[PDB]
Every structure is written in structure tokens, then in C-alpha cells.
């Protein structure tokens with residue numbers, strides 16, 4: 012009964028996120044994707060849309076499920092009966108801040124954090140940058156699941 | 169008559185800050201903790217509370233005093249008759265930005281900046297992260313002075 | 326017919342920027358400085374003032390011209406009939422984010438990004454830090470073109 | 483079913499290494515410690531003493547075994563029926579390198595690498611630094627397991 | 640009129656090196672690949688094979704030539720009638736060093752250095768890692784040009 | 797009463813080292829330059845010439861003395877009646893390492909390490925790079941004190 016949580020805001024989910032989902036799914040018996048929305052920061056997609064996009068991109072992963080989190084990621088992790096977090100690393104990641112959170116999460120709840128480097132082809136995509144480029148007419152279709160592409164296309168007119 | 173200034177917003181002061189205060193105090197004849205509040209950014213604690221918390225955490229350091237700064241840190245430093253700043257380094261610190269400020273401060277006023285690594289046990293605490301975790305019910309009591317813990321507890325109800 | 330674009334918000338232009346302009350100008354047949362203003366973020370100087378300051382600082386560079394960009398930097402680059410961007414590196418630069426943008430820009434439009442380290446004397450100046458120090462009465466005159474200094478002086482009273 | 487390999491030269495094993503072994507053992511069904519032989523550049527302890535030191539230091543982890551490797555780490559991993567490497571991060575880790583190896587290992591054999599931050603109290607110990615300090619008379623006994631301390635003090639008397 | 644030098648030991652040349660050659664050849668009138676001889680620390684291939692490998696791998700770039708250098712890279716650059724060095728950035732690059740050399744080269748001869756990020760698919764290959772993996776039986780043929788692969792498989796049979 | 801140790805191999809001392817000596821001498825009552833002997837890996841200048849070079853380059857600092865050390869830097873520091881090390885940061889510094897040593901030195905003897913950024917004009921010089929360039933005929937005389945320049949030009953004629 013091994014398990015890991017993949018936390019994030021996923022606004023929207025990218026192929027960078029999916030690559031990490033797939034690696035977590037391959038190495039742990041169970042994997043929970045936790046969508047932790049910021050109560051102060053409203054992004055582009057609403058919670059239901061973010062859930063849909065994640066679920067639409069992870070139908071091929073039987074041991075993975077999507078779930079909404081509130082408050083501490085470690086509280087969510089423990090409520091799943093798990094003690095592990097898996098985080099992706101890419102080009103631009105604030106790794107020092109990821110390390111700070113990792114140590115903090117370990118300190119407050121005994122939760123381990125495992126970092127894994129995203130595949131090179133998906134190493135420069137992030138949610139905020141994909142949105143920025145897309146909303147200015149740039150083609151990021153290869154850097155996002157097709158369901159996400161369909162929805163970004165809907166917001167052109 | 170050697171002296172160093174430890175500048176910051178201290179909202180709230182952490183055991184990371186105190187560790188740096190103690191090391192500065194051990195190496196310099198006089199040490200001034202400068203609380204430089206951001207006029208645009210309002211945090212959690214008001215200036216009086218921030219002063220109180222710093223003073224409540226530094227009663228054991230005879231050659232240290234707490235003082236409020238306005239404008240340039242270098243203007244505050246020079247007004248204390250000093251030419252040195254001591255800054256802490258921890259897990260997550262934007263060190264490139266600390267370096268930029270250090271060079272700038274040296275350029276504009278001839279003020280030296282000394283960096284020192286915080287003790288490992290207090291290396292992942294920061295004011296903003298401690299607040300975030302605490303306000304979601306997380307236990308950061310070991311990562312803050314007891315007086316600070318008492319005040320964070322008061323803001324639960 | 327070689328060419329490079331030097332993009333930025335230049336609010337205001339610094340001697341760090343100029344140093345990069347000069348190096349780009351020395352190595353490419355044509356060089357276009359693209360002023361890409363953020364539609365969400367309003368800074369200190371208006372677009373006309375930013376253009377003036379850049380033009381006032383680059384009269385000595387015959388193969389360089391100043392032009393306003395809208396939307397994607399790569400769209401601006403391609404519209405100049407170019408395939409290259411030149412970016413400066415200094416003390417504090419978020420290099421991981423510069424790398425992310427570089428890879429992204431290459432992916433979406435085949436545009437190459439060339440990075441060059443600014444001269445050490447101008448390695449700690451940035452637009453935001455120069456403004457912060459100046460508006461608190463600090464002397465950054467050596468870290469900015471004289472025309473920029475004149476304008477920063479006008480906003481004291 | 484799940485498994486991870488913890489590779490290294492372990493000359494000698496530190497409490498930093500053991501911390502990582504413990505994290506891996508808690509999150510995977512099986513952990514294999516792979517002791518890989520370095521080039522002409524040989525070390526203080528021979529292979530048998532290295533094996534024994536790791537073994538005596540990990541008696542509290544029943545799902546962990548120790549094994550020598552002679553070629554590619556990925557070949558070792560695959561021959562064990564696994565597809566994951568777990569590696570520790572400490573102060574002084576060459577991350578740039580670790581990431582290069584991770585990407586290379588993923589490319590040549592499809593093996594994933596997971597990185598974990600070592601506990602702060604054990605974040606500054608490394609085999610080479612421990613050896614250097616110990617040989618010069620310094621006390622690193624709190625940073626190494628007792629089986630290592632025993633063999634270390636026998637070498638210096 | 641415009642020109643760039645791409646310096647290195649190229650032992651052997653990788654598809655990471657070639658990617659950079661291609662970027663330079665597209666943006667400058669002339670590119671010179673400078674093969675500089677390392678100290679006593681010699682390598683796998685001799686100078687003539689190194690030259691031939693670079694030559695056979697760059698037949699698709701008519702504005703590129705290959706030349707041996709024996710002293711300072713800046714002396715090579717200047718003797719070629721140029722003032723620019725182009726260097727690739729990959730996962731595992733010692734940037735801290737590259738920047739030091741860039742500043743030193745600028746100081747001693749006024750030579751500019753331009754950095755370019757290698758294509759993601761070729762971002763984890765380096766000469767030394769490719770050699771290590773190949774000698775241990777791993778397949779790095781997708782990361783090296785065929786002229787290098789040919790000479791590499793002849794050395795291991 | 798206050799004191800700092802500036803440790804190194806100083807082979808040879810650079811104007812980067814001297815900048816740091818000057819910062820330390822201005823902020824502490826006493827500064828001791830500790831010349832520590834490296835392992836089998838010996839250098840260009842012998843110990844006596846190294847001592848003399850540091851001495852002749854620091855005549856303008858009356859509160860600074862020079863002394864050889866043979867073991868742990870912390871043992872040197874403590875035997876001098878001090879508890880502080882001052883170390884310079886330059887372009888190309890291995891910070892990751894410096895921090896590891898700082899934490900280790902604090903752990904084994906309670907000695908604090910203070911880091912200071914070298915002046916920009918002297919931020920790219922290091923002993924090894926200066927030696928490399930000088931031996932190849934390059935002019936590094938502006939980056940080294942004249943006592944070093946004298947002994948350097950006598951070695952190359």
C-alpha cells in the first residue's frame with residue numbers, strides 16, 4: 012500500500028505535469044493528484060474545469076485519482092493515508108523554494124518529498140507561460156494535452 | 169567601536185533571524201536590528217508588534233538594540249555610525265538578489281554586507297512560510313520564539 | 326543581413342542595458358531594441374518617455390533602432406525579418422526563467438536567444454532597483470545614462 | 483512489487499546516506515543499496531569494509547539489502563527488476579550533474595531518478611569532507627554511524 | 640563581415656556541440672570551430688581524429704570551418720579577425736565558470752561571449768558522459784553524430 | 797577584542813583577496829591571513845614567496861598579520877583567540893561547497909563564517925585563472941598586486 016501525492020494548482024495541467032503523474036504512477040501503488048486552489052489568487056480556469064482537464068489527461072493511469080485539497084498539503088497527504096509527495100522539476104523551477112517547502116513539510120508532518128526531472132521535451136512548459144503565449148496567439152499545442160488545447164481555443168472568441 | 173546592522177521586515181521574527189542576531193552580536197561590538205517596513209506592503213503584524221516580538225526575543229543580547237528605519241538601509245547604517253550589514257542565508261533565499269543589493273549598497277554608500285548561513289535546524293523557516301503554515305493550523309512552534317508563538321495563537325479566534 | 330532583437334520594458338533604461346545594446350550592435354549587422362510594455366503592469370515612465378530615454382542613450386549606434394512591440398517577442402522578431410534575440414545577464418537575473426523563455430521562444434518560432442554578461446561595473450543595476458534607490462534619495466547617477474538621471478531628478482519635486 | 487536503488491561509492495557511508503536509505507525504505511517495498519566501484523581513483527576503505535559498514539548501519543531496515551555493482555547503474559537497476567533510483571540532496575551536492583545523470587539514465591534505460599533532501603542536521607556531511615576532517619583530528623562522530631566511527635578511530639590510532 | 644568562434648576540446652564532438660554550431664552558422668556570416676589542446680590531461684581521441692569528426696559532422700554548414708588553437712582562446716579569436724565567442728549551455732554546465740572565463744576574456748582582449756541553450760533533446764549529453772556510458776556498453780548513438788558513432792564502435796570491438 | 801581569519805592557499809594572492817582583506821580589516825579589530833598548505837597538489841609558489849606576496853600587498857592595513865596553518869582551519873582560528881572566518885565571493889565561487897564547509901566548521905568548533913562579495917572589477921580573478929592566462933602570455937597585471945606581478949614576470953622571462 013505505497014502512495015504519493017502530486018499537489019498543484021494545475022491552471023491548466025500541462026504535459027510536464029502528466030509526465031510526472033506517469034512516473035509517480037509507475038513507482039507507487041497509489042497516486043493522488045491534489046488540486047490545491049489559492050483562495051487569494053484566481054487564475055484562468057475554475058476548479059471544475061481544472062479537475063476535468065486533469066481527469067481528461069489521466070484516463071490511462073488506473074492507480075491515479077484526482078481529488079480537491081483544502082489547507083495544508085501535508086493534511087491532505089495524511090488524510091489519504093500516505094506519507095509522500097512527488098514534485099516535478101523543470102526549466103525555471105524555483106528549486107530553493109521547493110527545497111524550503113520540502114523541509115518544512117517534513118518537519119511539520121513527517122512527509123517526504125521526492126523530486127523528479129520532467130522529460131526534456133516538456134521541460135520548459137509551465138501553466139503561466141503556456142497561458143501567456145497562448146493568449147497572445149502562440150502555438151503551445153504540443154506542450155499541452157489535447158483536451159487543454161481545445162479549451163484554450165474556446166477562449167479566443 | 170565595531171558595528172553591524174541586521175535589517176528586515178521581521179513579520180514575524182523567526183528563530184532563523186535570532187540565530188543571525190546572535191552571531192552578529194558575538195562578532196561585533198554593537199548590533200542594531202533595523203525594522204524597515206514596506207510602505208506599499210502591509211503584512212500581518214503592525215510595527216509596534218514587530219518591535220515587541222524582536223525585543224522579546226533578544227533580551228539575552230546586551231550589545232544589540234532594536235530601532236525603526238525609514239528609507240535606505242545604508243542611510244540607517246550610516247546614521248548609527250556603522251559601515252556594515254549582516255544578512256542571514258537560509259533554504260530558499262534569493263541569493264542573486266541579496267548579492268545585487270549588497271553590491272548596490274556598497275556602491276552608493278561604501279557599506280559592506282556580510283552573509284552568514286543560518287543553523288540547519290532553522291534553515292527552512294521564513295516569516296511568510298511560517299505565517300502560511302500557522303494560519304492553516306500547522307505547528308511551527310519550534311521554528312519561532314515563544315512570544316511569537318503566543319501571538320500567532322491569539323489570531324486563531 | 327544579420328540581426329538581433331534586444332527586448333525589454335526599459336523602465337528606465339540603464340547602463341546595463343546600453344552595454345548589451347553596444348555588444349549586440351558590434352556583432353550583428355542590424356539591431357532592434359523592442360520596448361514591450363506590460364498591459365497589466367504600469368511602471369514609472371510612460372511609453373513615450375521610455376522610447377526617448379532609449380533613443381537618447383543610443384545615438385552613437387548607427388545600426389540600432391528603437392521600436393515598440395505588441396504581443397509575442399517572437400512575433401516582433403520575425404516581423405523585423407530576424408531570428409535572434411540578445412539578452413543581458415547581470416547580478417540577480419532569474420536565469421532559470423530566462424532559460425525557460427529561451428527554450429519556449431525557440432520552440433514556438435525557431436528564434437535563437439543569445440545571452441551575454443553585462444560589464445562588472447554595470448552588473449548590479451536594474452530598472453526596479455535603480456528606481457527604488459533613487460526615489461529614496463540614493464545616488465545611482467553612475468548607473469544610468471545622463472538623460473535618465475535628468476528625468477529621475479525631475480520627479481523629486 | 484515496488485523498488486528503488488540507492489547507488490554510491492559509500493566511502494564511508496554517512497548518516498546523510500542512512501537518512502536517505504530510511505526515506506526510501508519507508509516509501510518502497512524494497513530498497514537495494516548499490517555500491518559501485520570508482521575508476522583508478524580509489525578510496526580509504528575497500529569493498530568489503532564498505533559493504534559491512536552499510537550493513538551494520540542498516541539493521542533497523544528489514545526491507546533493505548546491499549549489493550556490489552560493476553557497470554552502468556541502470557544495468558544494475560534493471561537486473562534487480564526495478565526502474566527507480568533514489569538519490570539524496572545535501573549542501574554541496576552538484577545538482578547540475580545529478581540532473582544530467584538522471585536525464586542520461588532515463589534516456590538509455592527508461593530508469594526514473596527521485597531526489598530527496600537530507601535531514602538538515604545531516605545536510606553538510608559528505609564522505610570526503612568527513613574523511614578530511616577526521617584525518618585532521620576533528621570530531622565527526624555525530625555525523626557518521628557508529629560502525630563507521632569504530633573503523634575510523636582504528637585507522638587513526 | 641560578422642563572425643563567431645566556437646571553442647572546445649571536442650573529445651568527441653556531440654550533437655549538443657553541433658546544435659550550437661548550427662545556431663552560430665545561422666546568425667553569423669562565418670563560424671570557426673576552435674579545437675584547443677588541453678593540458679597533460681589528454682583524452683580518448685587525438686587531434687586529427689577530433690578535427691575529422693567535427694568536419695564530417697558539419698558538412699551541412701558551408702560557412703563553418705575548423706581550426707586548431709594552441710594558446711589563449713582570445714588570441715585565436717583575434718587572429719581570425721573576430722571578436723565573438725559562442726558557447727553552448729546544457730544540463731550540467733558549470734555556468735559559474737563560464738561566466739568567469741567570459742569576464743576574463745572580455746577584460747584581456749575585448750572579446751564578447753554569447754551563450755545559447757542547447758536543444759532539450761541534446762541538453763544532457765557531454766563528451767565525458769557520452770564516453771563513460773559508451774565504454775560501459777550503453778547506447779548513446781542518438782546523442783552523437785554518425786561520424787563519431789563509427790569511430791566509437793571501432794574502439795569497443 | 798574582535799577578530800577574523802581570512803584563510804586560503806593564496807597561490808598567488810589576487811586583488812580579489814586584497815579587497816576582502818580590506819573589508820575585514822575595516823570591520824574587525826584584528827585580521828589574520830591564514831595560509832593553509834594544500835595536499836600533494838602543490839602550486840606555483842612556495843610558502844615563503846606566498847607569505848611575502850601577501851605581506852607586501854597588505855602594508856596599508858596595520859591591523860592585519862599573516863600566518864601559516866597546518867591542520868583544520870577551525871583549529872587555527874581558535875588558537876588565534878578568534879571565532880570568525882571571513883571568505884570572499886566571486887564569479888566562479890563554488891558556493892555549494894563554501895556553505896558545506898561553513899556548516900561543518902560551525903558544527904565541529906562553533907566557528908562562524910561570514911561571506912562578502914568581491915568588488916565587481918575584481919570579481920572574475922582567481923589564482924588559478926590568473927596563473928593560466930599569465931603563463932599563456934595574457935595581461936592580468938590589473939587584477940593582481942604589483943608584488944605578485946613582479947614575481948610573475950620573473951618566472952616568464
Ligand SMILES: CC(C)(COP(=O)(O)OP(=O)(O)OC[C@H]1O[C@@H](n2cnc3c(N)ncnc32)[C@H](O)[C@@H]1OP(=O)(O)O)[C@@H](O)C(=O)NCCC(=O)NCCS
Pocket residue numbers: 018019020021047082083084085105108111112113115116137138139140260297300301
Ligand atoms: C500547492 C502548492 C504545492 C503549489 O502548487 P503550484 O501552484 O502548482 O506550484 P507551481 O508548480 O505552479 O509553481 C509555484 C508557483 O509559486 C511561485 N513561486 C516560485 N518561487 C516562489 C517563492 N520563492 N516564494 C513564493 N512563491 C514562489 C511561482 O510563481 C510559481 O508559479 P509560476 O512559476 O507558474 O508563475 C503549494 O502552494 C501548497 O502546498 N499549497 C498548500 C498550502 C501549504 O501546504 N503550504 C505550505 C507549504 S510548506
Ligand SMILES: CC(C)(COP(=O)(O)OP(=O)(O)OC[C@H]1O[C@@H](n2cnc3c(N)ncnc32)[C@H](O)[C@@H]1OP(=O)(O)O)[C@@H](O)C(=O)NCCC(=O)NCCS
Pocket residue numbers: 175176177178204239240241242262265268269270272273294295296297417454457458
Ligand atoms: C529591508 C530589506 C533588506 C528587505 O528585508 P526583508 O523584507 O526582511 O527581506 P526577507 O528576508 O523577508 O526576504 C526578501 C523578500 O523579498 C522578496 N524577494 C526575493 N527575491 C526578490 C527579487 N529578486 N526582487 C524583489 N524581491 C525579491 C521575497 O519574497 C522575500 O520575501 P519572502 O521570501 O519572505 O516571501 C530591503 O527591502 C531594504 O533594504 N529595504 C530598505 C530600502 C532600501 O534600502 N532598498 C535598496 C536596497 S539596495
Ligand SMILES: CC(C)(COP(=O)(O)OP(=O)(O)OC[C@H]1O[C@@H](n2cnc3c(N)ncnc32)[C@H](O)[C@@H]1OP(=O)(O)O)[C@@H](O)C(=O)NCCC(=O)NCCS
Pocket residue numbers: 103140143144332333334335361396397398399419422425426427429430451452453454
Ligand atoms: C519583454 C520581456 C522579455 C521581459 O522584459 P523585461 O520586463 O525588461 O525583463 P527584466 O529585465 O526587467 O526582468 C524580468 C522581470 O520579470 C520578473 N521575473 C523574474 N523571474 C520571473 C519568473 N520566474 N516568472 C515571472 N516573472 C519573473 C522580475 O521581477 C523582473 O523584473 P525586476 O527584476 O526588474 O523586478 C518578456 O516579458 C516578453 O518577452 N514579453 C513579451 C510577451 C512574450 O513574448 N511572452 C512569452 C515569453 S516566452
Ligand SMILES: CC(C)(COP(=O)(O)OP(=O)(O)OC[C@H]1O[C@@H](n2cnc3c(N)ncnc32)[C@H](O)[C@@H]1OP(=O)(O)O)[C@@H](O)C(=O)NCCC(=O)NCCS
Pocket residue numbers: 489490491492518553554555556576579582583584586587608609610611768771772
Ligand atoms: C556511483 C555514482 C552514482 C556516483 O556515486 P558517489 O560516488 O557516491 O557520488 P557522490 O555524490 O558521493 O560523489 C560524486 C562525486 O563526483 C564529483 N562530481 C560532481 N560533479 C561532477 C562532474 N561534473 N563530473 C564528474 N564528477 C562530478 C564530486 O566531486 C563528488 O565527489 P566528492 O564527494 O569528492 O564531492 C555514479 O558515478 C554512477 O552511476 N556510476 C556507475 C556508472 C554509470 O552508470 N555511469 C553513467 C551515469 S549517467
Ligand SMILES: CC(C)(COP(=O)(O)OP(=O)(O)OC[C@H]1O[C@@H](n2cnc3c(N)ncnc32)[C@H](O)[C@@H]1OP(=O)(O)O)[C@@H](O)C(=O)NCCC(=O)NCCS
Pocket residue numbers: 646647648649675710711712713733736739740741743744765766767768925928929
Ligand atoms: C577550450 C576551453 C574553452 C574549454 O573547452 P572544453 O574542454 O570543451 O569545455 P567543456 O565544457 O567540454 O569542459 C569543461 C571542463 O572543465 C571543467 N570545468 C568546469 N568547472 C571548472 C572549474 N571551476 N575550473 C576548471 N575547469 C572547470 C569541467 O569539469 C569540464 O569537463 P567535463 O566535460 O569533464 O565536465 C577553455 O579551456 C579555453 O579557453 N582554453 C584556452 C586557453 C584560455 O584561453 N584560457 C583562459 C580562459 S579565460
Ligand SMILES: CC(C)(COP(=O)(O)OP(=O)(O)OC[C@H]1O[C@@H](n2cnc3c(N)ncnc32)[C@H](O)[C@@H]1OP(=O)(O)O)[C@@H](O)C(=O)NCCC(=O)NCCS
Pocket residue numbers: 611614615803804805806832867868869870890893896897898900901922923924925
Ligand atoms: C584553505 C581552504 C579554506 C581552501 O582555500 P583556497 O585553496 O584558497 O580556496 P579557493 O577558493 O582558492 O579554491 C578552492 C578550490 O577547491 C575546489 N573546490 C571547489 N569545490 C570543491 C569541492 N566540491 N570539493 C573539493 N574542492 C572544491 C575548487 O576547484 C577551487 O580551486 P580553483 O581555484 O582551482 O578553482 C580549505 O581547504 C581549508 O579550510 N583547509 C584547511 C583544512 C580544513 O579545515 N578542512 C576542513 C574544512 S570544513
